[PDB]
Every structure is written in C-alpha cells, then in structure tokens.
Amino acid sequence: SVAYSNNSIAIPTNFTISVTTEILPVSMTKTSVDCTMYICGDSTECSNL
Amino acid sequence: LLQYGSFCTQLKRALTGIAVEQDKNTQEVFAQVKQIYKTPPIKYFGGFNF
Amino acid sequence: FNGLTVLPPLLTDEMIAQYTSALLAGTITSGWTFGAGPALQIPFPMQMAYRFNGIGVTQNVLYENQKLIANQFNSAIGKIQDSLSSTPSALGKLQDVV
Amino acid sequence: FPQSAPHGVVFLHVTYVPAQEKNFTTAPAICHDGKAHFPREGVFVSNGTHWFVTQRNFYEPQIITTDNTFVSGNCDVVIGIVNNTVYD
Numbered sequence: 001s002v003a004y005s006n007n008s009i010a011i012p013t014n015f016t017i018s019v020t021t022e023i024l025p026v027s028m029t030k031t032s033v034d035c036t037m038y039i040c041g042d043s044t045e046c047s048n049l
Numbered sequence: 050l051l052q053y054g055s056f057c058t059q060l061k062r063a064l065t066g067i068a069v070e071q072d073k074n075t076q077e078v079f080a081q082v083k084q085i086y087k088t089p090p091i092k093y094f095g096g097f098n099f
Numbered sequence: 100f101n102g103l104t105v106l107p108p109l110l111t112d113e114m115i116a117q118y119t120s121a122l123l124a125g126t127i128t129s130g131w132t133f134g135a136g137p138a139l140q141i142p143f144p145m146q147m148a149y150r151f152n153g154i155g156v157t158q159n160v161l162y163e164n165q166k167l168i169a170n171q172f173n174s175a176i177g178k179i180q181d182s183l184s185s186t187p188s189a190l191g192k193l194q195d196v197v
Numbered sequence: 198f199p200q201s202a203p204h205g206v207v208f209l210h211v212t213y214v215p216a217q218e219k220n221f222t223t224a225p226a227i228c229h230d231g232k233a234h235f236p237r238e239g240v241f242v243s244n245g246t247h248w249f250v251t252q253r254n255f256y257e258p259q260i261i262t263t264d265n266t267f268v269s270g271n272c273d274v275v276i277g278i279v280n281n282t283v284y285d
C-alpha cells in the first residue's frame with residue numbers, strides 16, 4: 001500500500017543497469033514427401049488404382 | 050477400432066494443448082504486476098470521482 | 100453428454116478482479132512509475148499536468164482550469180454506463196465465442 | 198544486442214532502473230511579487246525549510262532562478278500555491 005497524500009512526492013537518488021534475455025523461434029524444418037513410394041511402394045498394380 | 054491406428058492420441062494431445070494455451074492467455078494478459086496495491090482510505094483526488 | 104466434458108479455468112473471477120483493482124490503484128497513486136520499478140507517490144493534479152505536458156500543452160493550462168476538467172471527466176465517466184446499457188450489440192464480440 | 202541460436206534468435210536487453218527513493222514535499226507553483234512561477238522542466242521540492250527545483254528522474258537540487266521558470270499567470274487562481282523568493 002503506497003502512502004498517497006496530496007502534497008508528498010518521492011524521487012529516486014540512485015540507479016541500476018539491468019540486462020535481460022528474450023528467446024524467439026524463427027524457422028522450422030523443411031520436408032518433402034513422395035506419394036507413390038509412401039503409399040503404393042513398388043507395387044505396379046497399386047499405382048494404377 | 051484398435052485396428053485403425055493412433056488417432057486418439059493425436060486428438061487428446063491437440064485438445065490438451067488448446068486448454069493449456071487458454072490458461073496461458075489469461076495469465077499473460079492480467080498477471081502483469083507483482084504487488085497488490087491498495088487504494089487509500091480517503092478517496093479525494095483533487096476533484097476527480099473514480 | 101457422451102464423453103464430452105468441460106474443464107474449469109484456473110483463475111476464478113475474484114482473482115481477476117483483484118488483479119484489475121491492483122492495476123487501478125497503482126495507476127491512480129503512482130502514474131507510470133510502478134510499471135518500470137518501485138512505485139513513487141505523486142499528487143493526482145501534478146500527474147495530470149505531466150500528462151498534458153506530453154501532448155504539447157503547458158502546465159498552466161491544467162492548473163487554471165482544474166474544476167472544468169474535473170467536471171468534464173466526471174460527466175464522461177457517468178455517461179458510460181448508459182452507453183453500454185443502451186446499445187444492444189455493444190458486447191457482440193464476447194457473445195460470439197460462446 | 199542480438200545473438201543466434203539453432204532455429205531462432207536471442208535478444209539481450211540493456212535497461213535502466215531507479216533505486217533509493219526518498220520522501221519530499223512539493224507544490225505546483227511559487228508565488229512571488231504577485232506573480233506565479235511554474236518550472237520549465239522539473240518539479241519543485243522542499244527539504245524542510247528551503248525550496249529547490251529538480252529533474253523528475255534523479256535527485257539534483259538547484260536554486261530557483263528566473264532561468265528555469267516561466268511566469269505565465271497570476272497568484273490568485275492556482276490551488277495549492279506556495280509563496281517564496283525567486284532569485285535572479
């Protein structure tokens with residue numbers, strides 16, 4: 001609870017230098033997928049369907 | 050149903066992530082200060098009525 | 100309900116109200132100092148003079164028209180409750196989520 | 198200052214924080230010769246018996262002079278005015 005009153009003030013007389021850190025993601029992994037090899041494998045008949 | 054795969058684990062994980070994010074949103078918006086300040090007993094601020 | 104449940108939020112409404120009250124007390128009694136470190140006292144008219152001085156208007160403008168500014172602020176605050184009550188869709192954004 | 202991390206960035210922020218505050222008594226304006234004086238930049242302050250003017254973020258008292266004040270008014274309108282001498 002701060003001591004409020006209509007004729008009083010507070011003023012700092014010293015300082016401090018502080019250093020903080022912030023971490024941020026930017027990019028993720030790049031992938032690629034080939035349909036037929038994943039789904040149908042080497043089955044020749046599967047690709048026709 | 051056990052023959053269809055592991056869709057249920059994914060569903061549960063997604064819902065849990067949404068819920069945790071919902072809590073974090075309110076925490077980030079409102080929990081700014083570290084002290085619980087209290088207003089003085091006498092409410093006279095130079096004519097302004099709060 | 101068939102396997103569907105609703106979980107309660109972590110913070111109750113009373114806790115949110117306490118946060119809001121803390122923010123209001125800090126801004127009324129200190130100004131912008133409590134957001135950057137320890138809170139420092141200052142009389143409210145002096146804070147308002149500081150805030151006028153931050154938009155290009157000198158302090159004597161505030162100090163010589165204190166009562167008029169206070170009356171205008173009081174009327175403006177008073178009108179808000181009626182404005183919120185009258186307009187039906189003033190709170191549509193919050194209702195859409197539900 | 199920036200730094201690089203796998204798939205992301207890190208920022209080192211250098212900031213200034215006040216400390217070691219103290220009580221003081223203040224007034225909005227100073228009456229003298231039937232004229233009101235306001236601070237050009239700073240706030241009036243009192244150490245118990247004398248009045249100074251100081252910048253608002255670091256305690257550094259100064260003698261009140263017409264250099265760092267402007268008159269712009271009269272002594273009979275401001276609420277809470279305190280009358281004292283102003284040097285030259």
Ligand SMILES: *[C@@H]1O[C@H](CO)[C@@H](O[C@@H]2O[C@H](CO)[C@@H](O)[C@H](O)[C@H]2NC(C)=O)[C@H](O)[C@H]1NC(C)=O
Nearest residue numbers: 012013014015016017214215216217218255256
């Ligand atoms: C302002 O704060 C600084 C930091 O606390 C004070 O520096 C210290 O002063 C004491 C006494 O002279 C020394 O024993 C410490 O070693 C100092 N700290 C450092 C990091 O050097 C400084 O004295 C304070 N100034 C005033 C006017 O209070």
Ligand SMILES: *[C@@H]1O[C@H](CO)[C@@H](O[C@@H]2O[C@H](CO)[C@@H](O)[C@H](O)[C@H]2NC(C)=O)[C@H](O)[C@H]1NC(C)=O
Nearest residue numbers: 092093094096097098099173174176177178180
């Ligand atoms: C601040 O404003 C409130 C709201 O108008 C004032 O409360 C009113 O006071 C009058 C007379 O005391 C009553 O007739 C009203 O019914 C009150 N309104 C409400 C909503 O309760 C209050 O008096 C004002 N404060 C000061 C110090 O004047």
Ligand SMILES: *[C@@H]1O[C@H](CO)[C@@H](O)[C@H](O)[C@H]1NC(C)=O
Nearest residue numbers: 004005006007089091092093
């Ligand atoms: C405001 O100043 C007057 C002096 O004129 C004093 O009586 C009153 O107590 C002050 N307000 C508060 C909240 O202390």
Ligand SMILES: *[C@@H]1O[C@H](CO)[C@@H](O)[C@H](O)[C@H]1NC(C)=O
Nearest residue numbers: 003008010217218219220221
């Ligand atoms: C300023 O005055 C109040 C009122 O007594 C007091 O509680 C507070 O400690 C004072 N500030 C400092 C830095 O001593």
Ligand SMILES: *[C@@H]1O[C@H](CO)[C@@H](O)[C@H](O)[C@H]1NC(C)=O
Nearest residue numbers: 243244245246247248249258
């Ligand atoms: C206030 O300042 C004057 C002028 O420097 C000085 O003579 C007086 O002792 C000071 N009072 C206190 C309580 O420090």
Ligand SMILES: *[C@@H]1O[C@H](CO)[C@@H](O)[C@H](O)[C@H]1NC(C)=O
Nearest residue numbers: 228230231272278279280281
């Ligand atoms: C100086 O201030 C005191 C107290 O406010 C007041 O009694 C006195 O009349 C003022 N001086 C003049 C010349 O009016």
